[PDB]
Design a protein around this ligand. Sequence first.
Ligand code: HEM
Ligand code: HEM
Ligand SMILES: Cc1cc(N)nc(COc2cc(CCN3CCC(F)(F)CC3)cc(F)c2F)c1
Ligand SMILES: Cc1cc(N)nc(COc2cc(CCN3CCC(F)(F)CC3)cc(F)c2F)c1
Ligand SMILES: C[C@H](O)[C@H](O)[C@H]1CNc2nc(N)[nH]c(=O)c2N1
Ligand SMILES: C[C@H](O)[C@H](O)[C@H]1CNc2nc(N)[nH]c(=O)c2N1
Ligand SMILES: [Zn+2]
Lengths: 419, 412
Amino acid sequence: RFLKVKNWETEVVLTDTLHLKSTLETGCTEYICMGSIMHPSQHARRPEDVATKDQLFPLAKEFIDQYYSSIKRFGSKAHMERLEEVNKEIDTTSTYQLKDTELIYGAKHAWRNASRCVGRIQWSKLQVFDARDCTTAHGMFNYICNHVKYATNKGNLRSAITIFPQRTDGKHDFRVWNSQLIRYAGYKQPDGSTLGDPANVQFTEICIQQGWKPPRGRFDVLPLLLQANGNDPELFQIPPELVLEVPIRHPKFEWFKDLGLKWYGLPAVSNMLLEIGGLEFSACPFSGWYMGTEIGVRDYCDNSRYNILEEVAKKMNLDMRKTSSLWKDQALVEINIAVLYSFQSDKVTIVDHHSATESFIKHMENEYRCRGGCPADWVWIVPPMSGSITPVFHQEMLNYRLTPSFEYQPDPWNTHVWK
Amino acid sequence: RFLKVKNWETEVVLTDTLHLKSTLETGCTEYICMGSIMHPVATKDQLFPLAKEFIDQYYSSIKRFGSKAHMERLEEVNKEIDTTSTYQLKDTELIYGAKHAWRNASRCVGRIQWSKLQVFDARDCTTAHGMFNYICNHVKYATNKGNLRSAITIFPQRTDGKHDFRVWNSQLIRYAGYKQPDGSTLGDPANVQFTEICIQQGWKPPRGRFDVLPLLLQANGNDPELFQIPPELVLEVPIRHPKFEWFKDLGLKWYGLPAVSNMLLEIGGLEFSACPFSGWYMGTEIGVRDYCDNSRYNILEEVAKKMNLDMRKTSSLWKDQALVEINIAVLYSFQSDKVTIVDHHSATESFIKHMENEYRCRGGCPADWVWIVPPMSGSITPVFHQEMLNYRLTPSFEYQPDPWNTHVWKLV
Ligand code: HEM
Ligand code: HEM
Ligand SMILES: Cc1cc(N)nc(COc2cc(CCN3CCC(F)(F)CC3)cc(F)c2F)c1
Ligand SMILES: Cc1cc(N)nc(COc2cc(CCN3CCC(F)(F)CC3)cc(F)c2F)c1
Ligand SMILES: C[C@H](O)[C@H](O)[C@H]1CNc2nc(N)[nH]c(=O)c2N1
Ligand SMILES: C[C@H](O)[C@H](O)[C@H]1CNc2nc(N)[nH]c(=O)c2N1
Ligand SMILES: [Zn+2]
């Protein structure tokens, strides 16, 4: 009927009715909760390939309805024309095309709806680049460069999304094969260890296989591997002057700069699927700006990532015999101090996890005020260090799936037939 | 039906069949997940299937299912429910029930020790003085001069609801909280309400920072009664730091024995409304939650102050820096006094080992990621990366209303 969530630090109780508009399954049941499953559900809104009219149109009707409801219409002339227009369009092309307004609406609301995104207070300030006229990988390279350059903005990062042509039959997808626009290569060393970023060893090998010439450093920005209209993907090197990087140094430890660490400034997720009114935009790279922990905790300290903890602990002269000295926890703090200090010293947008989580609490409040709820994944929202000293740790959250949304999709090299 | 859980750090995949045996709700629906919600007497007819379920499972665990003894027990339980509208667990069933309620505690990271549980049967207890005696012996046994040992003491089960046994304390050892006229709090701000209840019941408070609270014990539905745990049974650890000589000057201490006492133990449909159980601490419970939660002792600013940290902006991570040192202090202090403690790294690693074993021998292990992940350094512990299925098996430990919200006072 209606569900309350409580913050146990402040005893604020919020009352959620927005979940009544939830469309697809969470993966949980009355008897089993999957809230820590990374991909709990395969409930998609349309079949795998080109859907029949009774399949795609209801999804379309729902989104147009929602969009016109959003803008204080519904039933207006333009709404009833838009329905008949989408009707005839599906009647004659098995798909339909979004107007520019609806596309901008759907992107912003997919972001707004992203229960895993702590950054959503910014949701309505999204720059939407319409790339639906794109037709070749070279055109995708042009569009993505413009995205990177606009979003980077000489460090004053700007949120943006570039939306390439929607899926038609499934054999013609546009995909950015890179999981993110800018990542560092991972190199399988002969002994068995790994140089660079271990997460990317496979993708780095597809790139080498596709003819990329690895510099074989620790921070080799990977080429783009762009696929247009289902064709074989093509490699492009992003102009280095477009890839802003921050050398990581520490405000107290002078020896820290000598770890040779740097990171890139723009986080740009490029492997997710944007779904609006039943249409599926398989190539929609979206970017914002980093939360320090993503680099300082996950990218740097995960065991199967850069794994610098013991290296930094050594330089710190920390008791590393046993776990209880908390040498890992201590170094982990210093690394995230360095990351934050470095980005701010170079005037590159970055938000610490205290500020970010605080903003999200404010966002939840706004959303419950105006929308009647805010889907949020507590497992993703709580930062990967110092969880309980951030306000979201003490904040109950309801999770549910609202459309438009960003969705996971298979890695294209698992599903692509080469030519 | 099967369900797979992945570890994204190791790629190990486990297959959960055990979830097919849960029965009460998780709180989640098919379209909403409530996995971060903290909190989401039986008739004769209701009790028979619950009883049979538990007796069936006990006899299954001991490879005696279908046996002569299984079937007579089942019939013997049915007669009791017919006669008395309830039944009595055998001692073996009580021990097994209690161990398995711990085993099934999806929020508990220390379940690798679930089968080493000392079970104190206190179902013959009739008065608050009796409960105190039992609880004193529990505390002495568990504390074991710092070599802490897991233990539960089980008092008589619910009958009509009018005769509940209750430990009104949320935990057996807690420090008192006193709000001052000026709004400030002395002691443990969490326990201010419960301290007020004791003071009203007659407890004379020392009004200090680490006053061990008195037990407030209710037997057979009667008004609860006050008892002072004998001070020699409350092992405490003064918190010092290995590096900062100044840390001892914070005057911090903590009690060695964590002993939860406000929960309900549910075995075969029977409700044991008073079942205090204890183990030993994970360091972050004290060092992160007890000390650094804002609603708690809130010593981050104090500790950061003494670290000459820049506390102007959050991005200096002064809170994270001070939190780590505090948790080092907690572990170093307990270890130096040879009082059992476990750091969150060692604890999470053992629980993964345990979880894996539980999938192998039992077909799964229900687990609450929101509670298993430590409250600091979350992703540098192995559990953060471990997918976990959450579901509710019985026997279970269950939450229950605070007794002062339900008790109807006898004394005029
Ligand atoms: C503007 C600054 C932003 C910040 C600080 C931010 C923060 C974050 C963080 C920390 C995560 C978790 C990332 C991880 O642990 O891998 C996340 C997830 C996510 N964000 Fe945001 N975000 C921002 C902008 C955006 C934008 C512009 C979009 C889309 C238009 C977006 C959509 C998402 C989605 C879909 C996820 C889930 C990703 C997944 O499931 O793998 N975010 N965000
Ligand atoms: C032996 C060492 C033990 C360790 C290291 C341990 C560790 C923990 C921790 C860290 C929590 C989370 C507590 C919180 O954040 O408030 C917890 C919860 C819990 N533990 Fe264990 N525990 C231990 C023993 C036990 C025993 C002996 C029992 C029962 C016989 C038990 C049953 C539970 C239950 C039911 C919870 C959930 C608490 C709640 O829901 O409020 N644990 N444990
Ligand atoms: C828009 C946006 C803003 C922001 N501030 N952050 C993000 C998240 O962006 C990245 C995320 C990752 C890691 C993704 N992670 C890998 C392991 C996993 F698969 F298990 C879960 C997903 C690497 C990157 F380079 C990223 F830019 C996105
Ligand atoms: C057997 C066992 C071992 C262990 N290692 N730990 C525990 C849990 O022990 C305690 C937990 C708490 C606080 C519980 N917490 C209160 C705030 C909340 F209500 F929000 C959520 C529950 C206080 C204490 F004194 C504790 F001993 C139990
Ligand atoms: C809102 C949220 O569920 C709440 O803060 C939970 C989070 N995880 C927790 N985890 C543990 N171990 N103990 C807790 O009290 C909590 N509190
Ligand atoms: C198993 C677990 O769900 C997985 O490791 C999750 C935990 N929470 C996370 N939270 C964020 N923000 N990002 C992640 O990659 C993860 N990983
Ligand atoms: Zn759930």
